[PDB]
Subunit: 395 residues, 2 copies
Amino acid sequence: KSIPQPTNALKSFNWSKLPENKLEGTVWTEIDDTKVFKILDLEDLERTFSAYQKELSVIDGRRAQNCNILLSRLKLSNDEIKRAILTMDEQEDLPKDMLEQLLKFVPEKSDIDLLEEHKHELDRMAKADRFLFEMSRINHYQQRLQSLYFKKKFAERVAEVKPKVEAIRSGSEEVFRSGALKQLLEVVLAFGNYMNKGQRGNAYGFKISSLNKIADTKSSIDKNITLLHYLITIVENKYPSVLNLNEELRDIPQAAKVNMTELDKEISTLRSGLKAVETELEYQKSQPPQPGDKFVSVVSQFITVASFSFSDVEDLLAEAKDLFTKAVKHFGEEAGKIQPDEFFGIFDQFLQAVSEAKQENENMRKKKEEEERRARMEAQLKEQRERERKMRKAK
Amino acid sequence: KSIPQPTNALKSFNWSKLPENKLEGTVWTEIDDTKVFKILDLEDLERTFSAYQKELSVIDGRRAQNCNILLSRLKLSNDEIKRAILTMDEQEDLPKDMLEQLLKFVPEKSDIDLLEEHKHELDRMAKADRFLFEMSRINHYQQRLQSLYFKKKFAERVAEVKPKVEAIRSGSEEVFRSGALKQLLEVVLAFGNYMNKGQRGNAYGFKISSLNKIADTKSSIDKNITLLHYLITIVENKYPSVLNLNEELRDIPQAAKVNMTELDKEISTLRSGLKAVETELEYQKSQPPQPGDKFVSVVSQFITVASFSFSDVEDLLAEAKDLFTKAVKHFGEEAGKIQPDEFFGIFDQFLQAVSEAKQENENMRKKKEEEERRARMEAQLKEQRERERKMRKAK
């Protein structure tokens, strides 16, 4: 083994050791620190990196300064911090954003091993060192801290995810049962089968993305009248039911915005975080009640509502994905190969286009009433002077 | 089957038809366009979307306008365009960025089927329609166009990828054989095994990321002297060979910047694009020579250099990845689980840190010569007035 050890304790080097079972291939086979000790002025090393300064400081300066920032922000003593953890923060001294930061500065195995070396010198310890040591004394510090954070973030995390599950469920259902859309597809099929002479045009169906190409066909009379303007106009007196499309697909714009990777990522943290709280509740239940420890009392209340609430979220999600699968197939898309953002994005762009066309049409119609009054007035005003000329002729 | 067809040709609807083998589950089972034809004023449809306007215009307005933009930019007639394709652009009328755009407006099966309907009316065709039709007449238009583009982009694509393959090869080799680094790791191991009392500190090796934690340990004498400043100073008179580290790992900063996903993506397009040119050369070779067709003549010359050049790139890449695998294992990392950007990023940050420390040390040393002249001058200037006082005492 062989290395010598100091006269007094030293500051630590925050390294990560390689397991010995990972050597044999490596540089370290060729390396041997035991000769360095003879070469180095160890006395100088000890003086310049002593543990003392007189305060005990062993945790590295970077990590220590990061703590001192958090502690100056949290404004709690270690006694206060332990009470806040133990009572699951009944005085509300640990906001979400502080718990988050506190979850980054959780003492590690090697940190505690080190401060253990100085357990008889807590009163000499620098602020960060004493904080990390005191925190390592609280039973199941990390998993109480994780549980408190999860608890405080559960309501907003369910509120984030639920509207997205509703959008997929609703849009999927809407697209599947909309009679305005099904009648429009049949009229548009007719249009293409007539316009696309011969072959190119014995279709029994088309891809839903084709909807977003209708406005691309332009009138040979006026080039700002597209085939979509024309559809929307024809349909008024021929298939009026089609005009209920914006109403029947009202939740498509919102379903269009649901990212499925991010949805699943949210359900994933909710699920695994809830299992982690349940696990810590089983550990904590199997431990003798201590005064000022309110974990079992509080976490049980939370799981009751949280487990019911998430179970329901999981149900709405399972069923929403089912309907989406049915809706995808209903329009000839490959299940698995298309996401809601894309599928409902086809429909949402179309609704934006149908909406734009509706308006532009409406602005045309109002020129053709503005200028029909020109033909109505000039018809009556022409004949009025004509009656006063036949009077002037006779007279 | 059953639909009626127009008295005169119509403008097209740019749809994408669903194969009939994809129905049976879908809305289209419930849809039937044959009733719409009886309901619609077809005569009005025909008037308002006639093919004529008198120019023939059948391709949709969006795609047509996109063409007209490209053609007004390219400034070539269709005769000129065919000559440029056929001669592999010997007059250099097709820049890379135009070929790119030209590769987007390549006529599709359904476009040609349609313009085929009007092959006896080319002289009536709108600009875009005639362009797309003429282009569909050139033997293997798309794959001649793809080949010309590939050819023009090959030199810059090899120049993009090669420096990256060299960086991985060089950095991997450097890291593996650097004696300055291996001596530094042994000194730092010594440091941690001495400073990390007891357990925490019978290490035989550490993770290379630990290098970037050395400067985190701060001196208890001056807090701006870190353990890295201290290492760099100690090493001058004890292990001077270590100071050659910046020189021995000179290519680490560049290897640090190589994204492997993007490297492979570049090699992937080079490889598959070259196979596609080789394929089109085999087709074209197996066809009787036509005047003004210089494809076989030009592509053969290109493959000779391109196939030799890419073969070599593939060799440098195969070997670079081998060395990287050896270099990764040499420092106890899991092969497969770490990329060059990360592995060499550990080393590059370290070199940035060692460089910063070197300087900061050097600025300290120059205070300690600036203020050693204070102790040298004030030692001699104190004794000079002392000699003129013992003279004044005697006198």
